[PDB]
Swiss-Prot record, chains A, B:
Subunit structure as annotated in this protein's UniProt entry: Homodimer. Binds LGALS3BP. Interacts with CD2, CD3, CD4, CD6, CD7, CD43, ALCAM and CD45. Interacts with laminin (via poly-N-acetyllactosamine). Interacts with SUSD2. Interacts with cargo receptor TMED10; the interaction mediates the translocation from the cytoplasm into the ERGIC (endoplasmic reticulum-Golgi intermediate compartment) and thereby secretion. Interacts with CD69.
Residues bearing PTM N6-acetyllysine: 11, 27, 106, 126
PANTHER family cross-referenced by the UniProt entry: GALECTIN (PTHR11346), GALECTIN-1 (PTHR11346:SF97)
Gene designation: LGALS1
Membrane-crossing residue ranges in chain numbering: none
Disulfide bonds: none
Tissues of expression: Expressed in placenta, maternal decidua and fetal membranes. Within placenta, expressed in trophoblasts, stromal cells, villous endothelium, syncytiotrophoblast apical membrane and villous stroma. Within fetal membranes, expressed in amnion, chorioamniotic mesenchyma and chorion (at protein level). Expressed in cardiac, smooth, and skeletal muscle, neurons, thymus, kidney and hematopoietic cells.
GO biological process terms on file: apoptotic process; cell-cell adhesion; myoblast differentiation; negative regulation of T-helper 17 cell lineage commitment; plasma cell differentiation; positive regulation of apoptotic process; positive regulation of canonical NF-kappaB signal transduction; positive regulation of inflammatory response
Name this protein carries in UniProt: Galectin-1
Function of the molecule: Lectin that binds beta-galactoside and a wide array of complex carbohydrates. Plays a role in regulating apoptosis, cell proliferation and cell differentiation. Inhibits CD45 protein phosphatase activity and therefore the dephosphorylation of Lyn kinase. Strong inducer of T-cell apoptosis. Plays a negative role in Th17 cell differentiation via activation of the receptor CD69.
Length: 133, 133
């Protein structure tokens, strides 16, 4: 369990940027965003080799403790042993996740949060910088 | 309040850099660092006009919920309505706080902390970036 931040007050349209080091032997890492640990509008989980999955981004939500319907992306712009930046914004309909190598995708916003107040990082990613719009 | 962060895992000699916006109407702002909210190795409180002080930085510690004795610094390189960066490092004996315009001071490490895991901001300072060197 890595950095946890609360009271972020990230409003629609504003950008959260996180830069970190992906471990040389990384298996996976997680960024969680939402209201608190039980209420995540985005669970962002690049899996290098975890849960039987290789080089796959897994995303989901968590609402009142309940995991939503998982979705997988088809591009994996991360390497073990490198620096990576992630940029996230949102509006009421979607979160937009921008990643290295030009890749961007949307994830439906399934919760009803006015602002994103909570971020937690976990796994094989050493956070070097966080910037809030 | 403002941003609260935990699991910072800051170790001796490492640098925590915090950049933010000092509000236009600033009276006072606070950056708290320590083990947790009741165990602060540094309560860093620039006062523009507050609690009986004008353009003075007040520092204190908090040990098991109990405030220590305040120390008043001799410099004040802050202005309302501006951006500011504060850089903090610590060791066995002291915290070193680097401020805008080349100023710095030391504050004794009264709790003898070997790691800083908690930070919180309050008042007229909106955190825009946090970085780890
Ligand atoms: C839909 C179920 C089908 O089988 C599997 O069931 C697993 C759960 O029983 C699925 O894994 C979870 O997927 C969740 C997202 O939908 C979360 O990723 C969950 O892990 C939560 C977690 C991660 N971490 C963590 N700590 N550090 C790191 N790097 N990750 N701690 N807690 C994973 O345990 C796993 O994704 C899923 N597989 C598929 C293909 O969907
Ligand atoms: C008639 C004078 C009585 O003496 C005063 O007594 C006050 C209350 O104990 C002293 O203030 C506290 O000093 C503490 C450090 O020793 C803390 O600064 C305390 O405020 C807690 C606090 C402030 N903030 C905050 N957030 N944002 C801002 N701007 N401030 N968050 N938590 C302040 O309420 C204040 O420093 C002290 N001043 C004198 C000169 O002794």
């Amino acid at each position: 369990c890595g950095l946890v931040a609360s009271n972020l007050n990230l409003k629609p349209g504003e950008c959260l940027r996180v830069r970190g080091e992906v471990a040389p032997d990384a298996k996976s890492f997680v960024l969680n965003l939402g209201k608190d640990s039980n209420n995540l509008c985005l669970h962002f989980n690049p899996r290098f080799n975890a849960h039987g999955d290789a080089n796959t981004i897994v995303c989901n939500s968590k609402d009142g403790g309940a995991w939503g319907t998982e979705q997988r992306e088809a591009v994996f712009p991360f390497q073990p042993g490198s620096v990576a930046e992630v940029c996230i914004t949102f509006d009421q309909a979607n979160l937009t996740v921008k990643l290295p190598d030009g890749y961007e995708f949307k994830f439906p916003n399934r919760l009803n949060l006015e602002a994103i107040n909570y971020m937690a990082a976990d796994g094989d990613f050493k956070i070097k910088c966080v910037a809030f719009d």
